[PDB]
Amino acid sequence: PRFDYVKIAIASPERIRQWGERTLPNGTVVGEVTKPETINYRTLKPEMDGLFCEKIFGPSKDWECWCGKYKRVRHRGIVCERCGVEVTESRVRRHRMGYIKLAAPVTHVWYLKGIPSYLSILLDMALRDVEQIVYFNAYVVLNPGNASNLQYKQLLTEDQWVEIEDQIELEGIEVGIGAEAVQRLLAELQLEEVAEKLREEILASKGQKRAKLIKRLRVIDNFIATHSQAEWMTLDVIPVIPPDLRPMVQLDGGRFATSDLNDLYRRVINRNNRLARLQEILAPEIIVRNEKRMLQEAVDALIDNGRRGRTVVGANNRALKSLSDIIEGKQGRFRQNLLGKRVDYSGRSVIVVGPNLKIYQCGLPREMAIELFQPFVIHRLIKLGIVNNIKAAKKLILKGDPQIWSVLEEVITGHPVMLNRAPTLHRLGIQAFEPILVEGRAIQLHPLVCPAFNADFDGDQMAVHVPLSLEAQCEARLLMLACHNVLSPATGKPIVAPSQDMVLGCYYLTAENPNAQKGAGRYFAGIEDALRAYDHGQVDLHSQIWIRHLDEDVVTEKPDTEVIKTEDLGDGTVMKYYRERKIREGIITQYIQTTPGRIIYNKTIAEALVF
Amino acid sequence: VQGLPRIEELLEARKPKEACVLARAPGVCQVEESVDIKVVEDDGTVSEYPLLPGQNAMVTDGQRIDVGHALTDGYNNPHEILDVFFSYYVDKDGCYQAALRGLQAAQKFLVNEVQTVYQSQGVDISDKHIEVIVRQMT
Amino acid sequence: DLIEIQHASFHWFLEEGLIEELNSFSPISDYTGKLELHFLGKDYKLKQPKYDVDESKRRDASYSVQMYVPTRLINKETGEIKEQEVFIGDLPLMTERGTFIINGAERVIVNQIVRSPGVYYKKELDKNGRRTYSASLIPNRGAWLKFETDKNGLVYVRIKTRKLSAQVLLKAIGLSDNEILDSLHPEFYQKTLDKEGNPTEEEALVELYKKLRPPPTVSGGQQLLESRFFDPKRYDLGRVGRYKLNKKLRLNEADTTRVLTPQDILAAINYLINLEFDVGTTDDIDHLGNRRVRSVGELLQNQIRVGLNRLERIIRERMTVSESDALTPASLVNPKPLVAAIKEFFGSSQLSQFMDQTNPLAELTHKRRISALGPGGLTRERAGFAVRDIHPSHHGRICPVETPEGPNAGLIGSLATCARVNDYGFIETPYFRVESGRVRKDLDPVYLTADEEDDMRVAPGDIPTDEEGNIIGESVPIRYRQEFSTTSPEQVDYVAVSPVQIISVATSMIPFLEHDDANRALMGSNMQRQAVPLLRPERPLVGTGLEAQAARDSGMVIVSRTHGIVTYVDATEIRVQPHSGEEIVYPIQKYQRSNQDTCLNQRPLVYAGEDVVPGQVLADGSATEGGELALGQNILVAYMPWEGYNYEDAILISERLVYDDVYTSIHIEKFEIEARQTKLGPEEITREIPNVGEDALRNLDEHGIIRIGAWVESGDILVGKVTPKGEADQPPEEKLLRAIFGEKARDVRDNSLRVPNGEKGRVVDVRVFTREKGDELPPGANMVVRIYVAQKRKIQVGDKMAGRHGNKGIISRILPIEDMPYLPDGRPIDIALNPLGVPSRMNVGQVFECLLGWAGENLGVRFKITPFDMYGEEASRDTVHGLLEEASQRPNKDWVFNENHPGKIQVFDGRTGEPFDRPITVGQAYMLKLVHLVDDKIHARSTGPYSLVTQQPLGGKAQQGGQRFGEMEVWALEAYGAAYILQELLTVKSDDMQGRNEALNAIVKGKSIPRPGTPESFKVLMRELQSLGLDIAAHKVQLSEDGESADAE
Amino acid sequence: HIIYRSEELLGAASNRYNITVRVAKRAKENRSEDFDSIDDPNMKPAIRAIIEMSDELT
RNA sequence: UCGA
DNA sequence: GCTTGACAAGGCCCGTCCGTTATGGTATAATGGGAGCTGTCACGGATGCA
Ligand SMILES: [Mg+2]
Ligand SMILES: [Zn+2]
């Protein structure tokens, strides 16, 4: 559908179980994962309770349940009364989420071990103080009332609590350990009343610790505006990822390719079923305390493996992939699957220099163009009446008929193709071209776009991309063509220019060779008289040649306006002699001493700028 | 020889090892183990005693002191240009005009220092591309 | 011999390395003391292998041997000796070339350089304060002793944990107050004895246990300290650790090698105190005297040590549960944890690398690589600027030129030519003795082990010497204490033995190395290891002379050993008779597949009835000519720009290189298929496969497999295999189509092995490996078929060619011989290179090479020029121009040399027939053909496979993958106005199960549709954030309605 | 002369990101109007939208 | 590991 | 343009058969665990230590 904004908040335990429990035509819901079993070893079918269960996440095959007798498309939207699997599509398994009901609360590792440890800010404790209550290392006083020397939220050691047990003061003293005491300490908080208690402590006696009460006030004020509760930071219900996001496939040798999420999910349920077993048979308290500590470490390793404790491993000695380690890294879901994707209708090849070509034109081989433009060739084959479907067209393409290459010639005319070389530093590293079918197996690139792509012909490979829609073809032509990218986006200077081999051809053309004249000092009648004398053996490339040119816009190296060697003819006509010019003043005529190489260079600009 | 690490520490706004920026704009006449410069303002009354260790050189020659004229002979701290130009103008005019003149001195320092490094390597970069990222920082 | 770090290392393991590991493991005892088990390591069997060297490569096995030791199981009370040989493990043997064969693939063991064990001191300034001196006693295996010294005279001992006072460790090991101060200046030790108390022999073990293990016990403090440095099989200094302790600290005792002596800890404190008194040397971590190398004899000693420790736990867990007697000693030793320890080192470790077998130059180089990475070396992120630079102690030991560019720039080095590693693991260089200004070149060298820094004065091999009289030069440049200086020739001590002693065996194949830049000589040495073996190689004319030694040491050249008479020579064997069972047969391999898809063909060289010598070439290899090595061809070159065809490092060749079979190589590819066991039904290889007619069943012999010698093209069927299916979920469209014309579908599915795109050739080996024939098969397989297809590839447009000086390029045009320029005798030009890349990269030696090879072309003499001269300016210019004048003195060749322009002639144009305006330098260049061909770079995809989770297109040429549109490619289109191209590349081309169907249907029908749906990768991230405990959802801001949107459903 | 016709269309328009949408929205009308059997391979609907828009510009 |  | 008896074909349904599978038990005495980290550089907070 279409949405307008995305909002993120802390998931309440009533919200996590909303995704888990689904409505089924029966007395109870079945959307809870209770067993750590995934599938069977004999057949490749899952079990009725587990991480891959069909009664929770949906049917494995399309329109087929787990037990049998419903394997047709006639039954749509009903639930089998014998098994319990809804007969629907197999694409619903990647959208349904189960839940795991715990027997003991577990603090979230992002709020405890994070920066700046928002769980310890609300409790007005230290980082090491909350880390001793959680994981069962110290006791915290929850009711110090009617006692001689006891304080609220005071840490007690193991040897210190057994001394108060002998003294029964003579009243009701309540202590706690683990996350059951942290959840009780957060549930009895006063978030409406503690906000005005910190505001009167900032103005009066601030000192250096004014920023500590300011930072604590920012966390309390966020829980009132968002209408959240402070006890929601501890987890009672654990959500389960859909099973297609933790896939279990079988290789060719018979081994299964499991994920690291299945080994971390199984450690939670195996330690949760043991905790429910110890609490039923009235186990010793040193075993129940050790079981709840491993349940705290199993969920924290599932969320962020290696955040607080040691990093758990599996069979191989590498680190297991937790829920948080698939989004933060360079190989995470953000930087490898969302910002950058692998596209279809693409290809690559090595590049060779193509001279005798134009700009906005690239050389494209025949066996690569028949794969990139494959849906465009098939459409032209049915339109011309050669084939009737795709199976008759695909057999005609792979056969190698000469009529297929005549269809491919008529398709690529006017279809822009974006060329791309990695790495893409600036925006002119992706330009569009009009391809032509050439002979060979490499991309005939233009030598003028070589400083733009920063491409050298010693092993460079360039990626080829083909647009599909009609709006993408008009954007590649009007905005991304190579002819419209003369100027750089950084400065105002052009980059489409002669660089290496054409500068040496123009430097030698307009040079001055003082030995090979062969007819220097001759007068010619205009520009076209000297071009007709170069096709003959009359003049060389560097001969001193006087050219009758009546224009005044003549630029040269070290220009001058002074007149030296003034010579006067008869009838008042004066000759104005210069260093390179010879003007007959009263302007009648004007002769320019130059080389025929500079006339061929000046003729090339005339036929290119005047059309 | 320090082209690329200089542009990195300028955009990160890191604090250098040494910094000495005058807090006002007085008329300082230098009357000379370490050299000491006494700050006496003829327009004002209160003086200033700045810290100057022996490992720093001199830049001022006498009667030449701006509002944020530094004496470092090295790298300047861009965070110290803010609070000098802000606290000196928070009492004269309003706080919004003191923040506009404070951010303008920090903006002109960052653009002129990035262009200094890029021109030393023979690299042409237009000024309008640099000041867009400086606008996002200030 | 050039391979001595591999042959002498594995020979030491088979006689000293394996004996020492079994002697330290034996004997073992039980918990009570009933019986004892001790081995006899010095009497092992090492029986015969199972398969051949060539048979193990095609059968997918390993050239290994079985290891058996005699084992005596004795009992304490009852006198009984049970002698029985028990199987230990599978050990892969080293072949005759110095390599191993693991799972049918040839592998090498790269020598890894690490730090030597010993004591190292370092002056460290943690902040702007006083000068602090540290220490580090590194063992071969065990815990470290790091002694530090803070301000005000406080020396501390740190044993990872918090530091502690020096008197705590020095008194807990057992010492008195008078045995410390007599061998120590003791005035500096009074400052650290004041604020430390004064503990007794028993008043220090309690306080040591309270800080290391935070109740203290009088027996717990002794068992903790003894297990770290004094217990056997937990702390080892090594044979080289005892040698470095007696050299640095100048100790009198020796040959301990097992236990850390407590007198050595007192000497390390005494050297640390004296560093504040301005006496003593600070060690360097990058010095080669402090850096060791290890090889196969040492790396295998650590794998059996961690493999026998796992066997010790099972041998002690079986002599306690079984309380009864009369048990065999062959059941006490379980070979399973030790077999898996050797198989992990040779196949799953990082240091066992895939062998490069392109040419014999890359095979010789890969066995001599010195890499600083591995399990115990360095890290790719922990490598800095100081470890990648060249140390002054690398002169003659490690090659300063040959190193790979890119990520591993400086971490993977190469051994030099004359370098040698001793038994201690240090690199040595030979030197000639100089006595009173006279090089004593009469006796053996000295082989100094990097001890010439602070003691000796070493001159290189470039000084002009006389014939046994004296040295010609008066100012000899030397190196003394890592600094260069010029002293008198009577004051020097040693001189180098060769000018190629600094460079490696691959850099020495570059003629005129002194005229080329060091950056292009780095590229010229790497491109020489990538040259393919041609069909008919040719020896270079400007060779350096070292190609003959590298060909014999590669192992692919058959040499004589008997000094006999050759009797019979054919294309398969050579039969000679030895003289002063007398008929030996030398086998010759014909077109064997290599690791890099090249050939390993050998050709016979000798004839019948010829005297041979030990060390004579009998049959050369694929990339080896007669005697010397040959990696390329000598053809004409011209440095002239064509019409844009050699614009930016591009190559213009002629058509003469195509039809003369120049640069034509043979590539043999190998295909694989397997008839596995599907649980629905067993798969078998048949010929009658469905939906395939007679267009592909022409080369099958009624068995489903192709024959030998059949020309296969792209799209054929090599092995026809069927697979049973049990779906039975036919759509209603296919049920109506089948009911009309009949032809009910079978239960099988065609899974035949087919030829990939752009692949062709001739089938040469159709070897089938099935069961009940004498070979082992993997589980879940009935028949294994292996197909080898050979093809003959010519030189085409797009291939990457290079020379010996780093002038790489890609051919863009192949012109006919009438369009190429021609010499004034009528001979055309093969290559028209670009002269613009020469002066910008300082490639001057390639101009000296072509101008000298052109002199050797008209004379036919095949010059051998050694690098690094002779008289200055009289040995390179007047050698080339002097020998070009001798070729012009012939009466038929007067156009070769000109007086005005010496290294130039007049070249005529081939198209118009007119001469060019300026003379062009011509010559005979030696170009190579690299492995980066145009066939391996072609890839295209319309629609293929997809990913498992994100439903995105895959990546890879061998699996029909798509090109990645990364983050830098989005920023270019975002800087453009291409918003519709960016939405198309992210939605209808990747990660949309619905949008890809409608976009493909729109092109075939002819009416495109806008508005693609939500991509799949965003919905995966939405479900992953909800599993992290975050209530994240998408809403709508419409009028009086704030409802959550269902992106998934 | 197609590249000379595109530079005249991008000029005198004051927004180069807006006149390229009118070309893409006119090429879809030329494709739906060319649904008959006559199909010119040289004149694509994307190219015909640029020539027809430049003739009405003048 | 190797190419740009 | 429709209709009826006849002849097999085959899917569920309901019994038992035996391989498969979950569960509980065995009585000399046995009583705190191994395996690496020790050569990266810079910046920003957070303790903690006077
Ligand atoms: Mg390049
Ligand atoms: Zn069912």
Short mmCIF file of all heavy atoms in Angstrom, two decimals, chain A residues 308-330:
data_model
loop_
_atom_site.label_atom_id
_atom_site.label_comp_id
_atom_site.label_asym_id
_atom_site.label_seq_id
_atom_site.Cartn_x
_atom_site.Cartn_y
_atom_site.Cartn_z
N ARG A 308 27.67 -7.72 26.24
CA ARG A 308 28.00 -7.70 27.66
C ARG A 308 29.01 -8.78 28.02
O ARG A 308 30.09 -8.48 28.54
CB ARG A 308 26.73 -7.85 28.50
CG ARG A 308 26.91 -7.52 29.97
CD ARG A 308 26.88 -8.78 30.82
NE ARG A 308 27.22 -8.50 32.22
CZ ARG A 308 27.42 -9.44 33.13
NH1 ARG A 308 27.32 -10.72 32.81
NH2 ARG A 308 27.73 -9.10 34.38
N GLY A 309 28.68 -10.04 27.76
CA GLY A 309 29.51 -11.16 28.13
C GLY A 309 30.41 -11.61 27.00
O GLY A 309 30.77 -10.84 26.10
N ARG A 310 30.79 -12.89 27.05
CA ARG A 310 31.64 -13.46 26.02
C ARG A 310 30.81 -13.88 24.81
O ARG A 310 29.63 -14.22 24.92
CB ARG A 310 32.41 -14.67 26.57
CG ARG A 310 33.81 -14.82 26.01
CD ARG A 310 34.69 -15.63 26.93
NE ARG A 310 34.39 -17.06 26.87
CZ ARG A 310 35.11 -17.95 26.19
NH1 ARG A 310 36.18 -17.56 25.51
NH2 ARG A 310 34.75 -19.23 26.19
N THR A 311 31.45 -13.85 23.64
CA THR A 311 30.78 -14.20 22.40
C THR A 311 30.66 -15.72 22.29
O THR A 311 31.66 -16.43 22.37
CB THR A 311 31.56 -13.64 21.21
OG1 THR A 311 31.62 -12.21 21.31
CG2 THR A 311 30.87 -14.01 19.90
N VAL A 312 29.44 -16.20 22.10
CA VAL A 312 29.20 -17.64 21.97
C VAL A 312 29.51 -18.08 20.54
O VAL A 312 29.40 -17.30 19.58
CB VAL A 312 27.76 -18.00 22.38
CG1 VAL A 312 27.53 -17.66 23.84
CG2 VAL A 312 26.75 -17.28 21.51
N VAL A 313 29.94 -19.33 20.40
CA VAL A 313 30.30 -19.91 19.12
C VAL A 313 29.45 -21.15 18.88
O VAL A 313 28.69 -21.59 19.75
CB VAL A 313 31.80 -20.24 19.01
CG1 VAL A 313 32.66 -19.01 19.27
CG2 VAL A 313 32.16 -21.36 19.99
N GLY A 314 29.60 -21.73 17.69
CA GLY A 314 28.92 -22.96 17.35
C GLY A 314 29.88 -24.09 17.05
O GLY A 314 30.78 -24.37 17.86
N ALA A 315 29.71 -24.75 15.91
CA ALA A 315 30.66 -25.78 15.49
C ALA A 315 31.97 -25.16 15.04
O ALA A 315 33.04 -25.50 15.55
CB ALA A 315 30.05 -26.64 14.39
N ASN A 316 31.90 -24.25 14.07
CA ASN A 316 33.07 -23.47 13.68
C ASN A 316 33.37 -22.44 14.76
O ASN A 316 32.48 -22.00 15.50
CB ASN A 316 32.82 -22.80 12.33
CG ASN A 316 34.07 -22.20 11.72
OD1 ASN A 316 35.19 -22.55 12.10
ND2 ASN A 316 33.89 -21.31 10.75
N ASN A 317 34.64 -22.03 14.85
CA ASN A 317 35.06 -21.12 15.91
C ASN A 317 34.82 -19.64 15.57
O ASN A 317 35.43 -18.78 16.21
CB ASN A 317 36.54 -21.33 16.25
CG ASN A 317 37.41 -21.50 15.02
OD1 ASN A 317 37.16 -22.37 14.19
ND2 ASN A 317 38.43 -20.66 14.90
N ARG A 318 33.95 -19.34 14.61
CA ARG A 318 33.59 -17.97 14.31
C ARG A 318 32.47 -17.50 15.25
O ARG A 318 31.89 -18.28 16.01
CB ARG A 318 33.15 -17.83 12.86
CG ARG A 318 32.16 -18.89 12.41
CD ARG A 318 31.50 -18.52 11.09
NE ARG A 318 30.55 -17.43 11.23
CZ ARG A 318 29.26 -17.60 11.54
NH1 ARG A 318 28.78 -18.82 11.74
NH2 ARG A 318 28.46 -16.55 11.64
N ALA A 319 32.18 -16.21 15.19
CA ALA A 319 31.13 -15.63 16.01
C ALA A 319 29.76 -15.89 15.38
O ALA A 319 29.60 -15.83 14.16
CB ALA A 319 31.35 -14.13 16.18
N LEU A 320 28.78 -16.18 16.23
CA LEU A 320 27.42 -16.41 15.75
C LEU A 320 26.76 -15.09 15.36
O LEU A 320 27.04 -14.04 15.93
CB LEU A 320 26.59 -17.11 16.82
CG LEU A 320 26.96 -18.56 17.15
CD1 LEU A 320 25.99 -19.15 18.16
CD2 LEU A 320 27.00 -19.41 15.89
N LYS A 321 25.88 -15.17 14.37
CA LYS A 321 25.18 -14.00 13.85
C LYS A 321 23.91 -13.80 14.67
O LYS A 321 22.98 -14.61 14.60
CB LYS A 321 24.86 -14.17 12.37
CG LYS A 321 25.14 -12.93 11.53
CD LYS A 321 26.61 -12.55 11.59
CE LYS A 321 26.90 -11.34 10.71
NZ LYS A 321 28.33 -10.94 10.76
N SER A 322 23.87 -12.71 15.43
CA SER A 322 22.72 -12.40 16.28
C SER A 322 21.73 -11.54 15.50
O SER A 322 21.84 -11.35 14.29
CB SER A 322 23.19 -11.72 17.56
OG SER A 322 24.18 -10.75 17.29
N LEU A 323 20.72 -11.02 16.21
CA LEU A 323 19.71 -10.19 15.56
C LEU A 323 20.22 -8.80 15.23
O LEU A 323 19.78 -8.20 14.24
CB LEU A 323 18.47 -10.09 16.45
CG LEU A 323 17.58 -11.33 16.52
CD1 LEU A 323 16.52 -11.17 17.60
CD2 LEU A 323 16.93 -11.60 15.17
N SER A 324 21.14 -8.27 16.03
CA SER A 324 21.67 -6.93 15.80
C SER A 324 22.86 -6.90 14.86
O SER A 324 23.16 -5.84 14.30
CB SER A 324 22.06 -6.27 17.12
OG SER A 324 22.61 -4.99 16.91
N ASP A 325 23.55 -8.03 14.67
CA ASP A 325 24.75 -8.08 13.85
C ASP A 325 24.45 -8.22 12.36
O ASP A 325 25.39 -8.42 11.58
CB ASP A 325 25.65 -9.23 14.30
CG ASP A 325 26.25 -8.99 15.68
OD1 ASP A 325 26.45 -7.81 16.05
OD2 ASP A 325 26.51 -9.98 16.39
N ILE A 326 23.19 -8.12 11.95
CA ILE A 326 22.81 -8.21 10.55
C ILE A 326 22.35 -6.86 10.01
O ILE A 326 21.90 -6.78 8.86
CB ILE A 326 21.73 -9.28 10.32
CG1 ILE A 326 20.42 -8.88 11.00
CG2 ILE A 326 22.22 -10.63 10.84
CD1 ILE A 326 19.33 -9.92 10.91
N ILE A 327 22.43 -5.80 10.81
CA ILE A 327 22.00 -4.48 10.37
C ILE A 327 23.05 -3.39 10.58
O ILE A 327 22.98 -2.34 9.93
CB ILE A 327 20.67 -4.07 11.05
CG1 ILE A 327 20.75 -4.34 12.56
CG2 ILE A 327 19.49 -4.80 10.42
CD1 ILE A 327 19.53 -3.86 13.32
N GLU A 328 24.03 -3.57 11.47
CA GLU A 328 24.95 -2.49 11.82
C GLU A 328 26.24 -2.49 11.01
O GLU A 328 26.82 -1.42 10.80
CB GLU A 328 25.28 -2.54 13.31
CG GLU A 328 25.75 -3.90 13.84
CD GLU A 328 27.26 -4.08 13.75
OE1 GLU A 328 27.98 -3.07 13.66
OE2 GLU A 328 27.72 -5.24 13.79
N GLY A 329 26.71 -3.65 10.57
CA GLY A 329 28.00 -3.75 9.92
C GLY A 329 27.98 -3.26 8.48
O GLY A 329 26.97 -2.80 7.94
N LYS A 330 29.15 -3.37 7.85
CA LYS A 330 29.26 -3.05 6.43
C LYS A 330 28.57 -4.11 5.57
O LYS A 330 28.08 -3.79 4.48
CB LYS A 330 30.73 -2.92 6.03
CG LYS A 330 30.97 -2.20 4.71
CD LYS A 330 32.45 -1.90 4.50
CE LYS A 330 33.27 -3.17 4.42
NZ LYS A 330 34.71 -2.89 4.22
#
